[PDB]
Design a protein around this nucleic acid. Structure first.
Ligand SMILES: CC1(C)C=C(C#Cc2cn([C@H]3C[C@H](O)[C@@H](COP(=O)(O)OP(=O)(O)OP(=O)(O)O)O3)c(=O)[nH]c2=O)C(C)(C)N1O
Ligand SMILES: [Mg+2]
Ligand SMILES: [Mg+2]
Length: 539
DNA sequence: GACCACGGCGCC
DNA sequence: AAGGCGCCGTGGTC
């Protein structure tokens, strides 16, 4: 409350105002610090950064990232957002956390510093009692924020000249597709407008509508509808292709080259640390956790992500991670037995599906099986199965049934997990990360059963996220020792960059750290690839 | 301009 | 009604 001259005493909390939300791109407008009942406003923010030992307060990682951009090794420390998010993962914004735990998120640095201190006191008290949440804070989230700050500030190289050239190629293909669509429709229209497309497909052409949209009840034109309609009229396939090319061009090919930072010549995402219900990170501005890889054009975009000249990318991927976690949480003996004997479930399902042997399973088979074991696992109705393979029932009941007959303890674990969630109001990961799911007790079946699929999924997806975050915290100092860089995390994958002659040693070490992160009832196995670009590194 | 809801869709 | 995200264009408001 009392104005004191900059600089603040050790241990102060910082408030700061940025000209924009992305710290790699922002001007530091103001900087203050609060300790006891004094607030210190720095006359020259940038200068003032130099006097700090660490960035401590709301959104600390943001300031640390900016400091790193200016060549200061200023790490983030305590952040009330991380405390709030461990207490309840619905705590995602400083606005929400302040309203809930005792202040108001304003636009003034001194008020943000004082808010940071107050909220930290109140949240610390709430979190002190909780051994496992405290453990997650001090051993996972708080150090992870320093790791993320360095990843953000470091960035990842992009082959711009390559993408500009790809843009023109795809633009000309898009022209061929839309002209062909307009010819079949008998007139031009805005093919990007799904309202205009709806009228053309179902009113002008005689195509049958298959589904309706959720909020406004229009006849849907989604890929799923179109796919069911593909053999009904030639325009449909053209539209599917048009949709793919314009999606990839508008979201990746065109924007990415314009996001290259002028000082680094790289792409700098944001790793949002308090943004998901399950404990996963999210990525934005740009999102680098959803770069294409599935289709041919998608792979071509993936190739644009490259190593520094003289370095290589190293991509590490936990194998069947959520199934391994499921084996451990449930203690199902058959499941555990599959991984203990180095077997592959996705492969075996692909086998089963395509009428093929284990030894023969195109990777496209596997990828198809992947979202089927996960789909089924997480409450996919026998119904929607029908429209993944073919004719039910008992072809779908007995598929979802054989699935659970194989691993009976899983059903038990699910019911057990739901029951505890109803009584306690929350579920939790292996490490005690929790998610409150109040709708487990809803008296409307569709709402309640949606709640249930969210609830029993969280311990599985959340444990895998705990495991990866813990692996990042352990791995990071080893990397800097070896002169390598951690660049990206994509949920259960890590992408590193290393000097060519160190690349294999780094891969090898990183793989071992990730597999031994926290021994379970089943081994964790990590596939690793090395390449000059992200695509070739994932093999 | 900036923002919104919606439908749609990229990845894990 | 598989789970978890963030981003895009359209159509419209302000
Ligand atoms: C876009 C792309 C390529 C990605 C897809 C997906 C997905 C999905 C991923 N996951 C969850 C569960 C997973 O454990 C964890 C990580 O998932 P992957 O690494 O892709 O699998 P996994 O590690 O099991 O096996 P590998 O041995 O790595 O192969 O995240 C899901 O719950 N649903 C999915 O559809 C599908 C198949 C839809 N795709 O076409
Ligand atoms: Mg994986
Ligand atoms: Mg993966």
């Amino acid at each position: 409350l009392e104005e004191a001259p900059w600089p603040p005493p050790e241990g102060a909390f910082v408030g700061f105002v940025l000209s924009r939300k992305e710290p790699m791109w922002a001007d530091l407008l103001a900087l203050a610090a609060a300790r006891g009942g004094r607030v210190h406003r720095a006359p020259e923010p940038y200068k003032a950064l130099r006097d700090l030992k660490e960035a401590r307060g709301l959104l600390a990682k943001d300031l640390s990232v900016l400091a790193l951009r200016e060549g200061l090794g200023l790490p983030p420390g305590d952040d009330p957002m991380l405390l709030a998010y461990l207490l309840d993962p619905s705590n995602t914004t400083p606005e929400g956390v302040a309203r809930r735990y005792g202040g108001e998120w304003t636009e003034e640095a001194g008020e943000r510093a004082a808010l940071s201190e107050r909220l930290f006191a109140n949240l610390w008290g709430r979190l002190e009692g909780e051994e496992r949440l405290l453990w997650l804070y001090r051993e996972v989230e708080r150090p992870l924020s320093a790791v993320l700050a360095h990843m953000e500030a470091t960035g990842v190289r992009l082959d711009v000249a390559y993408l500009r050239a790809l843009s023109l190629e795809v633009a000309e293909e898009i022209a061929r597709l839309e002209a062909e669509v307009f010819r079949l429709a008998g007139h031009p229209f805005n093919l990007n407008s799904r309202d205009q497309l709806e009228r053309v497909l179902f009113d002008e052409l005689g195509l049958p509508a298959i589904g309706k949209t959720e909020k406004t009840g229009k006849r849907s034109t989604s890929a799923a509808v179109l796919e069911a309609l593909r053999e009904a009229h030639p325009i449909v396939e053209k539209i599917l292709q048009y949709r793919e090319l314009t999606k990839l061009k508008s979201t990746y090919i065109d924007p990415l080259p314009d996001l290259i930072h002028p000082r680094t010549g790289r792409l700098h995402t944001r790793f949002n640390q308090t943004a998901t219900a399950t404990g996963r990170l999210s990525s934005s501005d740009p999102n680098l956790q959803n770069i294409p890889v599935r289709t041919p054009l998608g792979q071509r975009i993936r190739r644009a992500f490259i190593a520094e000249e003289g370095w290589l990318l190293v991509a590490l991927d936990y194998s069947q991670i959520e199934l391994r976690v499921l084996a451990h949480l449930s203690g199902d003996e058959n499941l555990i037995r599959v991984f203990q004997e180095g077997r592959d479930i996705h492969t075996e399902t692909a086998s089963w599906m395509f009428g093929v042997p284990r030894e023969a399973v195109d990777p496209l088979m596997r990828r198809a099986a992947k979202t089927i074991n996960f789909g089924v696992l997480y409450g996919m109705s026998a119904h929607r199965l029908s429209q993944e393979l073919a004719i039910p029932y008992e072809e779908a009941q007995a598929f979802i049934e054989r699935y659970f007959q194989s691993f009976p303890k899983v059903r038990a674990w699910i019911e057990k997990t739901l029951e505890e969630g109803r009584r306690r109001g929350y579920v939790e990961t292996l490490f005690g990360r929790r998610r409150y799911v109040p709708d487990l007790e809803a008296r409307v079946k569709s709402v309640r059963e949606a709640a249930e699929r969210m609830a029993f999924n969280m311990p599985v997806q959340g444990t895998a996220a705990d495991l990866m975050k813990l692996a990042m915290v352990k791995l990071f100092p080893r990397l800097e020792e070896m002169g390598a860089r951690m660049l990206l995390q994509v949920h259960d994958e890590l992408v590193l960059e290393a000097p060519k002659e160190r690349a294999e040693a780094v891969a090898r070490l990183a793989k071992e750290v990730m597999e031994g992160v926290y021994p379970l009832a089943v081994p964790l196995e990590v596939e690793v690839g090395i390449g000059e670009d992200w695509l070739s590194a994932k093999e």
